[PDB]
Amino acid sequence: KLALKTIDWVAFGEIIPRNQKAVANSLKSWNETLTSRLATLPEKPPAIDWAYYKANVAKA
């Protein structure tokens, strides 16, 4: 489980100089990207039906 300092975005909007809005944008999207990502990428992968493979092999 992760800690994730909570964040109000309209404030974040209101603290970036204009000559730095670029950065801030990319920073936002990465976050969103990253977030979407974790929503879909499961903690662990599926297990592996070892019995089954053991059941159908040939090398010992």
Place this chain on the structure above:
Amino acid sequence: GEFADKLNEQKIAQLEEVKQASIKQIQDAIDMEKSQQALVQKRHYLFDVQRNNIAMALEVTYRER
């Protein structure tokens, strides 16, 4: 007779600039305070976004591995 009118209109004019200044200055005590309040909380978020980003990126990485 005029003695009064010029002086009076003078005297009003004054307190008219006085009330004016007074509004304008207290509006500025006000702005300053907003400026502050902002720099307070406000600014950390930038770095928080950044730290959060890292945390996630390592998690994704761990998971991907």
